[PDB]
Design a protein around this ligand. Structure first.
Ligand SMILES: [Ca+2]
Ligand SMILES: [Ca+2]
Ligand SMILES: [Ca+2]
Ligand SMILES: [Ca+2]
Ligand SMILES: [Ca+2]
Ligand SMILES: [Ca+2]
Lengths: 190, 190
């Protein structure tokens, strides 16, 4: 509440856009409310787009910036999850995020990079290549690194909207290991 | 390998059909391989259909049965997850599963009921009503109850195919709690 207004731009994918949530339930809205509750005179613009890849973010970063009433004081950069989820090459997410950060650096807008994590079913080579993007870029650009901020959703499954669980091949094997003894016993009796 | 052949019918949804898996990677195929490895002369027919509700299962249970070369010795019944995931009424999943089990009882085919669990984001009233279906029906029909056989997928996230995580409203709040201190600190410096 006290002081001049601080403009924060939340630039991201569904985790900022608020997929199947009301606008005032989305991360940018709730973050703003918590900042102001702590006494900061902060306005957070929601520029999340569900489905955005790093490539889609790069295609629109300049237009989003030039559309605001003034240059934002701070950008929250949160992209890459959709790259990883669609199996796009980790090096291409790195390339696009690097260039997004270049355009922000060229305008002297400071950035907080929201780190993302590869889904653990994917290859270890992919996982290393993807996960290292965010600390690597944060160092190169002297951005703050916000770590894996959907970590509480991994701890607490009741915080995530319901969806289908589809096992991998190895997940089916664990399902069999879990049930084969009981099925074997039933078959033994008839 | 030794003895006369035992015919098991796997009647279910994507968790039996093997969504985005090869047929020989699906639960019915791998269960068969593990049973035979333990010395049982068992053939498991995959009658999983991805997307099947309890209602869809009921509409096709008689045709699946009458299509086999003889009457199956054992049915694995695994439905309800899609009901719960689509927000269909728990009482309607109970009604359809009851009737499926009636048709099997009327043919004297013994059944193992695969219990399902409501996603923890859903209401506690829904969760109670849905989760109680499977032990309740198993008692009424003297079916074996296989408990929550995708339990290992909840333990080990690397066993499940990757997909989007969409927070609830309360999940967004946990995300804010996770990040507000660091964002507050960054804003305090500029
Ligand atoms: Ca509402
Ligand atoms: Ca300003
Ligand atoms: Ca500038
Ligand atoms: Ca293959
Ligand atoms: Ca037989
Ligand atoms: Ca019969």
């Amino acid at each position: 509440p006290t002081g001049p207004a601080i403009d924060v731009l939340a630039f991201g994918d569904s985790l900022f856009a608020g997929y199947r949530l009301d606008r005032d339930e989305s991360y940018p809205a709730r973050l703003q409310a918590a900042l102001r509750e702590r006494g900061l005179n902060v306005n957070v613009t929601n520029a999340g787009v569900s489905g955005d890849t790093t490539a889609a973010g790069l295609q629109r970063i300049d237009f989003v910036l030039d559309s605001m009433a003034g240059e934002p004081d701070l950008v929250l950069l949160e992209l890459g999850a959709n790259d990883m989820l669609r199996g796009l090459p980790a090096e291409e997410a790195r390339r696009n995020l690097d260039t997004i950060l270049q355009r922000l650096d060229q305008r002297d807008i400071p950035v907080m990079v929201y780190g993302m994590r590869a889904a653990p079913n994917l290859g270890g080579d992919y996982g290393r290549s993807f996960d290292s993007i965010f600390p690597d870029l944060a160092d190169k650009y002297d951005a703050e690194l916000v770590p894996f901020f959907i970590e509480p959703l991994i701890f607490d499954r009741s915080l995530v909207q319901q969806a289908q669980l589809h096992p991998t091949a190895q997940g089916v094997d664990a399902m069999v290991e879990q049930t084969v003894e009981q099925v074997e016993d039933r078959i033994d009796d008839l």
